[PDB]
Short mmCIF file of C-alpha atoms and ligand atoms in Angstrom, two decimals:
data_model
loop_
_atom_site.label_atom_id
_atom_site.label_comp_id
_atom_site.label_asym_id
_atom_site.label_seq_id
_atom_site.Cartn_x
_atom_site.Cartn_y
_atom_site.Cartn_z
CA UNK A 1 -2.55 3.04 -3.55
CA UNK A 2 -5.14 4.71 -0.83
CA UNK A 3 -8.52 6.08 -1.72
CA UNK A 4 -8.89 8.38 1.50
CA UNK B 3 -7.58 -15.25 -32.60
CA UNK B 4 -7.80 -12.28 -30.37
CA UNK B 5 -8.84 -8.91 -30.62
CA UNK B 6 -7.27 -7.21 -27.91
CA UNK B 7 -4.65 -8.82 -25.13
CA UNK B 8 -6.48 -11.97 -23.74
CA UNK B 9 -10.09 -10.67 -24.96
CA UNK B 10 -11.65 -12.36 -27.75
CA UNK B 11 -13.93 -10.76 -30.51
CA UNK B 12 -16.55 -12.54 -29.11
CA UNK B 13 -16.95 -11.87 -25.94
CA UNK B 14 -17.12 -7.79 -27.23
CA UNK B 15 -20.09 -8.83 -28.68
CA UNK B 16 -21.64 -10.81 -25.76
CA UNK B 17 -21.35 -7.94 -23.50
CA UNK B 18 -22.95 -5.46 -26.05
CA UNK B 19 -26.07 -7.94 -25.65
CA UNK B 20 -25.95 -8.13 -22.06
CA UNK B 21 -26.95 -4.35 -22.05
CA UNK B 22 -29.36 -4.55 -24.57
CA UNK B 23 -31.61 -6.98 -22.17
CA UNK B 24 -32.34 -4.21 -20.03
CA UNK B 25 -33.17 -1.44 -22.20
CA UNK B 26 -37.08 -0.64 -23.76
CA UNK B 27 -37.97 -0.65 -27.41
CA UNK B 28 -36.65 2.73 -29.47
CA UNK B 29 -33.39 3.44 -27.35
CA UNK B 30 -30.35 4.51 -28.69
CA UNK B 31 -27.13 4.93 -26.39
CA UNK B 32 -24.27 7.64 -27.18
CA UNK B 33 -20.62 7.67 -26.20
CA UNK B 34 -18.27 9.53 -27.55
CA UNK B 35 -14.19 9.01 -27.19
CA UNK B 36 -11.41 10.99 -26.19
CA UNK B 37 -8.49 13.16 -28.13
CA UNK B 38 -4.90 13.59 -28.34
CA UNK B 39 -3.58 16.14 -25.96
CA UNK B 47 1.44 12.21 -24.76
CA UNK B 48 0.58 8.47 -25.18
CA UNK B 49 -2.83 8.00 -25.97
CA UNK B 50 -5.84 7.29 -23.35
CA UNK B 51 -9.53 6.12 -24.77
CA UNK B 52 -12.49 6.53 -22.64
CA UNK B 53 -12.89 3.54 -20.97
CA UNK B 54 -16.44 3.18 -21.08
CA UNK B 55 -16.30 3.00 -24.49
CA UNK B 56 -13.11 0.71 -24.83
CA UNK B 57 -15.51 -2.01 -22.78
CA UNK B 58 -17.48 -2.61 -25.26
CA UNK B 59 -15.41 -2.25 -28.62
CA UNK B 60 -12.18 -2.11 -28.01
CA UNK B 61 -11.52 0.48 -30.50
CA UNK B 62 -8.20 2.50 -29.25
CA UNK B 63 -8.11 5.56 -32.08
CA UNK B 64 -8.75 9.44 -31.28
CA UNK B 65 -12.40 11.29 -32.59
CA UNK B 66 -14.22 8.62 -32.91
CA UNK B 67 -18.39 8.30 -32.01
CA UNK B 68 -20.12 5.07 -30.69
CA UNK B 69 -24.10 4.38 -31.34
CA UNK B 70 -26.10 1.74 -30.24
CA UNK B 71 -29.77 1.09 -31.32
CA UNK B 72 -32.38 -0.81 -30.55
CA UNK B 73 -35.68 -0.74 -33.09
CA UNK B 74 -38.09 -2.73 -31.77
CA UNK B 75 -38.65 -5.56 -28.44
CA UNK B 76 -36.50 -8.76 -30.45
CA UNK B 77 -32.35 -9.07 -29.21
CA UNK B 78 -31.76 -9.69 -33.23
CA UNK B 79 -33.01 -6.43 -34.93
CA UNK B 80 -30.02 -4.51 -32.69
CA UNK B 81 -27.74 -2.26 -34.66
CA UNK B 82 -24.31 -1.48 -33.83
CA UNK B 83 -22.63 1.98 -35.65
CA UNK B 84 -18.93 3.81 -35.53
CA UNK B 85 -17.90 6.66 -37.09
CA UNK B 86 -14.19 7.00 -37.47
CA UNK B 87 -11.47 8.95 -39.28
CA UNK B 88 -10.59 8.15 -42.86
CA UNK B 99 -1.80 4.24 -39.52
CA UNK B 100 -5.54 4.19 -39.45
CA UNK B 101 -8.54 1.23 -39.64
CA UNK B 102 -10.76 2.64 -42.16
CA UNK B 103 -14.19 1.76 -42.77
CA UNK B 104 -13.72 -0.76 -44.31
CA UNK B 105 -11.90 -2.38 -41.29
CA UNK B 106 -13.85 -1.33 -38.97
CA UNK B 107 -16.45 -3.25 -39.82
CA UNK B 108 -14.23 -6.53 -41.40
CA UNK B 109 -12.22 -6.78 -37.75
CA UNK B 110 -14.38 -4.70 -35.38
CA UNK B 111 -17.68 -6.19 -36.34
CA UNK B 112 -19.48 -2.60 -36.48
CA UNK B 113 -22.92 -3.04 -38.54
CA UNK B 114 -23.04 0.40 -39.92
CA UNK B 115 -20.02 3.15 -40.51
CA UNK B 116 -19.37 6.32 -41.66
CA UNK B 117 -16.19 8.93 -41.81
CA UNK B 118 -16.32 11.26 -38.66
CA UNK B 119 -16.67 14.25 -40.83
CA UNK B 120 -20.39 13.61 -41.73
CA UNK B 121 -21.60 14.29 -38.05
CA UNK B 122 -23.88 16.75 -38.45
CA UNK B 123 -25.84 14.70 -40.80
CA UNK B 124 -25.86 11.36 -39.53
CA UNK B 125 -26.47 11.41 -36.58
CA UNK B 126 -29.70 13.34 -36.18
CA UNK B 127 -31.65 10.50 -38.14
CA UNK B 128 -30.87 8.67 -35.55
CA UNK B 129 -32.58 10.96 -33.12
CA UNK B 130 -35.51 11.77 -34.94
CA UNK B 131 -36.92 7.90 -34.43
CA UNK B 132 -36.25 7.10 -31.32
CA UNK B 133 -38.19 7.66 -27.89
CA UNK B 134 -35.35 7.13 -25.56
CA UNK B 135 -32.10 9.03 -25.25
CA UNK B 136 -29.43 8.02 -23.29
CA UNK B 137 -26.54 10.10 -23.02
CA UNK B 138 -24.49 11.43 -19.63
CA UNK B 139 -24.74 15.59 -20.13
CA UNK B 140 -22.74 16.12 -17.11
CA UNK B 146 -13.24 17.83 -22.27
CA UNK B 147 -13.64 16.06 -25.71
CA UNK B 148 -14.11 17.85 -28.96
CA UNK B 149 -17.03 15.57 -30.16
CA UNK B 150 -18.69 15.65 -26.66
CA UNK B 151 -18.89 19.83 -26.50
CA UNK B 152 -20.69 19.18 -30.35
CA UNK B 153 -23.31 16.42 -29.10
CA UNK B 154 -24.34 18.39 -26.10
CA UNK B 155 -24.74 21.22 -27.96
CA UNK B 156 -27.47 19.88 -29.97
CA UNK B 157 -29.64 18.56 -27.08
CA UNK B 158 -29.77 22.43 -25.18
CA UNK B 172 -41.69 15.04 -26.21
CA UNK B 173 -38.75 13.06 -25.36
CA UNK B 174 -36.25 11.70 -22.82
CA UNK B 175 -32.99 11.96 -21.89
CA UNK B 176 -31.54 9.64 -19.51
CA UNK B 177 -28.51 8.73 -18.28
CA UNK B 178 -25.78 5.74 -18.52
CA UNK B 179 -22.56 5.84 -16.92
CA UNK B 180 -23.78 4.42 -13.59
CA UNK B 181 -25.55 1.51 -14.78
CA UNK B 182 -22.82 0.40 -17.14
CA UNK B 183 -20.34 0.42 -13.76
CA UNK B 184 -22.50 -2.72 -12.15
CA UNK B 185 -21.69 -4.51 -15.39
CA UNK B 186 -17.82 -3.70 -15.11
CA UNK B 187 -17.62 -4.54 -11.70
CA UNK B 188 -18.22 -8.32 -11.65
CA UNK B 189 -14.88 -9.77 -13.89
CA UNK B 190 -15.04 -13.05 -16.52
CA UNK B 191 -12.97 -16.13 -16.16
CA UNK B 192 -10.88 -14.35 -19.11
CA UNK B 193 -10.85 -11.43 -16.90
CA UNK B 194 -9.29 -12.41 -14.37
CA UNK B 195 -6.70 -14.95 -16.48
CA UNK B 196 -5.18 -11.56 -17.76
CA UNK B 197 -4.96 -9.42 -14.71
CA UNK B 198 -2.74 -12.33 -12.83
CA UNK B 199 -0.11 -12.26 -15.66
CA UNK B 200 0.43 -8.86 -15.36
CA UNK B 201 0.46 -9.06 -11.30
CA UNK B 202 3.07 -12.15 -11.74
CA UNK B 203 5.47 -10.32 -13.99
CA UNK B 204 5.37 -6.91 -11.49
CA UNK B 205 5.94 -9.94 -8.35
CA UNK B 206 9.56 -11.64 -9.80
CA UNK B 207 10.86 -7.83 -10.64
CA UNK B 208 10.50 -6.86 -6.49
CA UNK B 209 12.24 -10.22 -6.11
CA UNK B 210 14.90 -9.15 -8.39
CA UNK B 211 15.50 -6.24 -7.22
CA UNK B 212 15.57 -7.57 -3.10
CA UNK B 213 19.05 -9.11 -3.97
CA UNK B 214 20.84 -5.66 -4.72
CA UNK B 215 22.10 -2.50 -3.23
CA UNK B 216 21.25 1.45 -4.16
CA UNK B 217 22.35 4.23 -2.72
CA UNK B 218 19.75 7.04 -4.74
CA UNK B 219 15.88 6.80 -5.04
CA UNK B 220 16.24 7.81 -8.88
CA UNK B 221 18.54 4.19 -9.27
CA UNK B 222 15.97 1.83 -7.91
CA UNK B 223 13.11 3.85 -9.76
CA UNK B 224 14.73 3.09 -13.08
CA UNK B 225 15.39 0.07 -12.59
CA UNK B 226 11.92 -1.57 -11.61
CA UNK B 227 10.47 0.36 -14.95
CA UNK B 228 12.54 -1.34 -17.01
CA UNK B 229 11.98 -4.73 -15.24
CA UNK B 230 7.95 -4.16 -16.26
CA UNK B 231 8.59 -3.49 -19.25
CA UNK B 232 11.31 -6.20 -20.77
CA UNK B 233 8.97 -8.77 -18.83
CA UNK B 234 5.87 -8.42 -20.95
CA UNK B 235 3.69 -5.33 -19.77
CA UNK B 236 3.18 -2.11 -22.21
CA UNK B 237 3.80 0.72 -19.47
CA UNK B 238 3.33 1.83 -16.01
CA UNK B 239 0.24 1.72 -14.14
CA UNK B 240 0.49 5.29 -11.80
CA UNK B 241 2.92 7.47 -10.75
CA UNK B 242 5.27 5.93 -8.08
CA UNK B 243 6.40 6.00 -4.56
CA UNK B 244 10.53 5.56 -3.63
CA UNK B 245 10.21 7.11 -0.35
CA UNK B 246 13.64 6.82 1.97
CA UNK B 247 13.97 7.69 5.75
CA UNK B 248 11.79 10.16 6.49
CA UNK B 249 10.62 10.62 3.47
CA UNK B 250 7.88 7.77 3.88
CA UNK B 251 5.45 10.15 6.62
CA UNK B 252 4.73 11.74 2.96
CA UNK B 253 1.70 9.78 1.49
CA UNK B 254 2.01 11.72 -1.41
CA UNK B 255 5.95 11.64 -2.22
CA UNK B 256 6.68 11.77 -5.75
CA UNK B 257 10.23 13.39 -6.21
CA UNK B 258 12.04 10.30 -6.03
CA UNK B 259 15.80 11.96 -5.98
CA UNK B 260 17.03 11.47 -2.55
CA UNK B 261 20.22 9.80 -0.95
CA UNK B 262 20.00 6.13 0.77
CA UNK B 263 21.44 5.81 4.11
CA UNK B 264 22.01 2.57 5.67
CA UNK B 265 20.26 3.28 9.11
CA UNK B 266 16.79 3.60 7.36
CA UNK B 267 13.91 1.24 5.45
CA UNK B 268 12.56 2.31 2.35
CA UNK B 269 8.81 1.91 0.88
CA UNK B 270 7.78 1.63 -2.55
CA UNK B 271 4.66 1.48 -4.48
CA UNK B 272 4.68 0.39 -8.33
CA UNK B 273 3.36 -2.23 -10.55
CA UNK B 274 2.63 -2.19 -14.33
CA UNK B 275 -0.23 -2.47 -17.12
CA UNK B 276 -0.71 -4.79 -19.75
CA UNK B 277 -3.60 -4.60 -22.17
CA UNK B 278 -5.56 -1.83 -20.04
CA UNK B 279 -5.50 -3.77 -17.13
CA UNK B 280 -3.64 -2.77 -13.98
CA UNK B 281 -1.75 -4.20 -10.81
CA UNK B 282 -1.05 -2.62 -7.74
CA UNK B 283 1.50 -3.49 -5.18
CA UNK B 284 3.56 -2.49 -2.15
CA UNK B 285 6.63 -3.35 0.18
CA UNK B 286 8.64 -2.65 2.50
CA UNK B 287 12.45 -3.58 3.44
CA UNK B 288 15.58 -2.52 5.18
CA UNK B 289 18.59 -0.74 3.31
CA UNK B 290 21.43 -2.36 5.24
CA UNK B 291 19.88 -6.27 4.50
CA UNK B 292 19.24 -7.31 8.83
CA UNK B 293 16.37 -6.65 10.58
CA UNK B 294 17.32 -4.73 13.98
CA UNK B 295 15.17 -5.62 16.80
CA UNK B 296 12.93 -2.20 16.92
CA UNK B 297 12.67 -2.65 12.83
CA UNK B 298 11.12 -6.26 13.63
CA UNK B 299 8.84 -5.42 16.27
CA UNK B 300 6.83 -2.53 14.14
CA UNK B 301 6.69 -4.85 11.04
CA UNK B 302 5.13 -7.36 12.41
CA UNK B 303 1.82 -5.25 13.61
CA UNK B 304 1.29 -4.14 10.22
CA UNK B 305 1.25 -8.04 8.73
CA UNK B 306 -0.54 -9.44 11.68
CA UNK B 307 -3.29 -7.28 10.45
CA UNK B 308 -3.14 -7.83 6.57
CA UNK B 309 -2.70 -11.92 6.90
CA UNK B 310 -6.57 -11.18 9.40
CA UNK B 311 -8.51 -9.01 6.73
CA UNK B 312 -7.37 -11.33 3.52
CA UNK B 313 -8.84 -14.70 5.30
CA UNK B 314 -12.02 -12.87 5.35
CA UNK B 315 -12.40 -12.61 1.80
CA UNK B 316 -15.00 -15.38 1.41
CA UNK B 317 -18.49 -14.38 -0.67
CA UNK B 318 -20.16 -16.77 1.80
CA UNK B 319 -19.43 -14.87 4.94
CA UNK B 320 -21.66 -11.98 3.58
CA UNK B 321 -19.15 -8.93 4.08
CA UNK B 322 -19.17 -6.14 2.90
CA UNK B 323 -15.84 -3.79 2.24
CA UNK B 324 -16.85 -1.08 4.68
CA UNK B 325 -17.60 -4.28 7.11
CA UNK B 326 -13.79 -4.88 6.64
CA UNK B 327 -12.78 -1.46 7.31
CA UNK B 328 -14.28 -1.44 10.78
CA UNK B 329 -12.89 -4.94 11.32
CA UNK B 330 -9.03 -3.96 10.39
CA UNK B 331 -9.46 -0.76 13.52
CA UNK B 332 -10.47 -2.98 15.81
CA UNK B 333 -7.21 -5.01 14.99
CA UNK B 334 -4.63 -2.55 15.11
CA UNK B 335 -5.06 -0.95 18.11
CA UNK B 336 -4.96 -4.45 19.99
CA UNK B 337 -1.07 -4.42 18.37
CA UNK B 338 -0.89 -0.80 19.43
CA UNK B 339 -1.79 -2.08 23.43
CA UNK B 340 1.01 -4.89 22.65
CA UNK B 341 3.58 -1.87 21.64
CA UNK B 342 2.62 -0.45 25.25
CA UNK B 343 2.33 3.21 22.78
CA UNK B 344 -1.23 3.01 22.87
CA UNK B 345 -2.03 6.22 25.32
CA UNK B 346 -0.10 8.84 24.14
CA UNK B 347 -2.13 11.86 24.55
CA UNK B 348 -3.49 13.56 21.32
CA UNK B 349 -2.27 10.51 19.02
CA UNK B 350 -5.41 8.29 19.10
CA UNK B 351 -5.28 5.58 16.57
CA UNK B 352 -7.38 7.24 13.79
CA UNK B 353 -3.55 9.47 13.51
CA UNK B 354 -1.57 6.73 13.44
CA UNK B 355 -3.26 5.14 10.82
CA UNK B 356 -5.29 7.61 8.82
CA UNK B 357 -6.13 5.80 5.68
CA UNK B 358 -8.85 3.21 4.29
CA UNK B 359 -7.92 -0.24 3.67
CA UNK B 360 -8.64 -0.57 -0.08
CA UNK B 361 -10.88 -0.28 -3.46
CA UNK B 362 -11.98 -2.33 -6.17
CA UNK B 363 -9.39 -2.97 -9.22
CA UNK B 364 -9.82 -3.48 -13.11
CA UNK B 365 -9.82 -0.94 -16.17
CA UNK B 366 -9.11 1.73 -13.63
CA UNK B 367 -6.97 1.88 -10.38
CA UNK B 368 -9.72 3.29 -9.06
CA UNK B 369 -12.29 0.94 -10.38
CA UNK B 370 -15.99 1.76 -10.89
CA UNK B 371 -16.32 4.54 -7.72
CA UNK B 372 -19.62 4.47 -7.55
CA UNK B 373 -21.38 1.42 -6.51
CA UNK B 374 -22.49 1.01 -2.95
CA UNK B 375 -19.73 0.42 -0.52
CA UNK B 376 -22.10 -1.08 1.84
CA UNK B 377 -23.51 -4.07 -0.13
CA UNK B 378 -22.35 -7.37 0.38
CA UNK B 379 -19.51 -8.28 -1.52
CA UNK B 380 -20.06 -10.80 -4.60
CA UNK B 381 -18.45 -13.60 -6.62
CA UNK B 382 -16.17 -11.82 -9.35
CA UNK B 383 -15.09 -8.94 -7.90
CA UNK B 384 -11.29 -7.71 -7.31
CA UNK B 385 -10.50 -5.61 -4.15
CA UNK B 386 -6.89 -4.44 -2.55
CA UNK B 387 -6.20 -5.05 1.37
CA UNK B 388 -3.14 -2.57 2.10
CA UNK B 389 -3.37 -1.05 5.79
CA UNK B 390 -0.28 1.01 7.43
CA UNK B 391 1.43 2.97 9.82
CA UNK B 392 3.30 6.10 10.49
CA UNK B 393 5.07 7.39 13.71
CA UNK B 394 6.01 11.10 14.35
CA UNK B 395 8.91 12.88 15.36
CA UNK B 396 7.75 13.78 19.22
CA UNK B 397 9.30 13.27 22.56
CA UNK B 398 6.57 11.69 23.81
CA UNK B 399 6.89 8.34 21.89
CA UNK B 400 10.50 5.83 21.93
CA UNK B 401 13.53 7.33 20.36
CA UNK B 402 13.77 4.31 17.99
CA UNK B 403 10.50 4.64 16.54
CA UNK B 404 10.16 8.27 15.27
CA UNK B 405 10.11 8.97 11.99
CA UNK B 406 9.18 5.09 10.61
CA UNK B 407 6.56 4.29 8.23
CA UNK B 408 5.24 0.70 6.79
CA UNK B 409 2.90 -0.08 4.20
CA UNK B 410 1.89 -3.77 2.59
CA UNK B 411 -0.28 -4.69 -0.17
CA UNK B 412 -1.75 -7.73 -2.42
CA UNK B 413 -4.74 -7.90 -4.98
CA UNK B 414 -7.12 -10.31 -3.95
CA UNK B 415 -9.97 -11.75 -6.21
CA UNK B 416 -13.24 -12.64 -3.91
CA UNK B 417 -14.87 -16.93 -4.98
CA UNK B 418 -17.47 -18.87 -3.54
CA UNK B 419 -16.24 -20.71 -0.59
CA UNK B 420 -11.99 -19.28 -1.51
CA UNK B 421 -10.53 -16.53 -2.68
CA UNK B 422 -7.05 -16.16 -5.02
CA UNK B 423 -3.97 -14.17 -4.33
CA UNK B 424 -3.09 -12.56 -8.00
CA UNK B 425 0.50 -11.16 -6.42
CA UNK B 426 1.41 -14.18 -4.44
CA UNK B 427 5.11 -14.37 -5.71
CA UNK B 428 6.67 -11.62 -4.12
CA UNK B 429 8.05 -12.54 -0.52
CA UNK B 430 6.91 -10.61 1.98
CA UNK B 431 8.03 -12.72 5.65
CA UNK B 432 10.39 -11.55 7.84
CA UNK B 433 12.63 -14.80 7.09
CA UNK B 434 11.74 -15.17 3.40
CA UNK B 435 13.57 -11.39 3.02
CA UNK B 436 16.65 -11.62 4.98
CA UNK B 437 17.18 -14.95 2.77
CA UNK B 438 17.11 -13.01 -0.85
CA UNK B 439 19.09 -10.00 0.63
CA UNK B 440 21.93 -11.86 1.71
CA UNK B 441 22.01 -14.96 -0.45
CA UNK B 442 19.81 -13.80 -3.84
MN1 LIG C 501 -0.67 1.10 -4.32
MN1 LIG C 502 -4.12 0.57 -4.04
#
């Protein structure tokens, strides 16, 4: 998974 | 007929011309691959346009004069191993040479060229290149081989949904059974990968229980199950250097409570929105999307009636982006423009979430919850195709394989  | 997993040798050597069309006469371009430090990881840049997997190894390509046919294509490699021999009989390299003979190959390449293109800001061949470059000019190439990587082929994108179906049947498989440890259900979807056809894990995974899930980073994976909480889980495998990515969500008892039904449903009211939009004829672009998918949740927020808690503003509750483009990488190609319209060919994830606290100020049967849900979605003309599309993910679709199988 999430970049940021 | 292949060279590598669902990539033919001749498509290698299409994409080795496509770069050549946009350089000037007397260029020469200089990558250099990786080492053993552990399974073994090339330099992807370099694995796009060979697919050569062995350790100290040097890539050349040169150009000699303004024609597409006059290009020359050179390895150096070490002496199971290829050879030079095979390099050349399987790999298709024009020129080769044993790695040893560095120092004196190499600079006749230099010496008749005008144009050097090499990225100067750890290998053991790339410390000995640099070295020898500190009326010429040196330019570089990592960015401009990135727009090439991020726009996929038909055979492309064949490959990356076979390895997306295989991780999709092992979630399924493993919705029909109990586990009472984090470490029992991690063990068991590896092996699932890897007796179904994929070569090894993609990234490091998420088996978050309880409370455990507020953790975006939770790793440990050695915790006990109890059968008042939901559990979230983020894993998928690799086959051929290409990688899926994948997440869901589900309750440990096998029922739905009424509080448990009531959060899940904000999160996928918002994914089902953002993956309709993934049509190259609307003209979005993915930080477009990312303002779209705020607006959305805090309309379900309003819904929830826990939309004005003071100091908790939506930006809390939800503190993530909604996704990135996919291939050789997780990651993929970081830096083209996220503000460009998006194109035909290109893969992107659409995974949005959220996370409540443990404060007074919010319901007693909400604290200490978190959700997460995610697909891989490839972006066509006037369409779009779901690459992860067999793992269930509706409310009544679940309860059906939980209790049933
Ligand atoms: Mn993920
Ligand atoms: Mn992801």
């Amino acid at each position: 998974x999430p970049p940021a | 007929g292949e060279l590598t997993p669902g990539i033919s040798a001749l498509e290698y050597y299409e994409r080795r011309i496509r770069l050549a069309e946009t350089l000037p006469p007397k260029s020469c371009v200089i990558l250099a691959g990786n080492d053993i430090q552990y399974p073994f990881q090339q330099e992807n840049d370099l694995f796009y346009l060979s697919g050569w997997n062995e350790p100290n190894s040097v890539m050349i390509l040169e150009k000699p004069t303004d024609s597409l046919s006059d290009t020359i294509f050179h390895m150096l490699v070490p002496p199971f191993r290829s050879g030079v021999y095979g390099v050349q009989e399987i790999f298709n390299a024009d020129e080769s040479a044993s790695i040893n003979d560095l120092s004196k190959y190499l600079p006749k390449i230099i010496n008749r060229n005008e144009f050097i293109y090499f990225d100067m800001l750890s290998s053991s061949n790339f410390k000995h290149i640099k070295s020898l470059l500190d009326n010429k000019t040196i330019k570089p190439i990592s960015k401009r081989i990135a727009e090439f990587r991020k726009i996929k082929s038909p055979q492309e994108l064949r490959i990356m949904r076979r390895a997306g179906q295989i991780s999709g049947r092992s979630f399924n498989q493993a919705f029909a059974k109990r586990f009472r440890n984090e470490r029992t259900l991690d063990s068991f979807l590896h092996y699932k990968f890897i007796s179904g056809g994929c070569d090894k894990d993609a990234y490091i995974p998420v088996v978050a229980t309880g409370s455990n899930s507020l953790c975006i980073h939770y790793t440990r994976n050695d915790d006990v199950m109890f059968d008042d909480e939901m559990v979230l889980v983020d894993a998928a495998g690799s086959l051929g250097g290409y990688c899926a990515d994948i997440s869901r969500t589900w309750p440990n008892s096998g029922k739905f409570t009424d509080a448990q039904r009531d959060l899940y449903e904000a999160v996928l009211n918002v994914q089902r929105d953002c993956i309709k939009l993934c049509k190259a004829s609307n003209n979005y672009s993915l930080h477009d999307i990312h303002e779209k998918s705020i607006t959305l949740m805090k309309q379900e927020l309003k819904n929830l009636g826990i939309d004005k808690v003071s100091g908790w503003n939506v930006e809390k509750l939800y503190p993530h982006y909604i996704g990135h483009n996919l291939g050789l990488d997780v990651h993929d190609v970081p830096k083209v423009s996220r503000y460009e319209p998006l194109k035909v060919g290109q893969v992107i994830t659409i995974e949005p979430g959220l996370y409540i606290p443990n404060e007074e100020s919010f319901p007693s049967y909400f604290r200490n919850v978190g959700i997460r849900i995610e697909d891989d979605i490839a972006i066509g003309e006037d369409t779009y195709t779901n690459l992860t599309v067999e793992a269930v993910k509706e409310i009544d679709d679940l309860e059906n394989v939980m209790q049933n199988g």
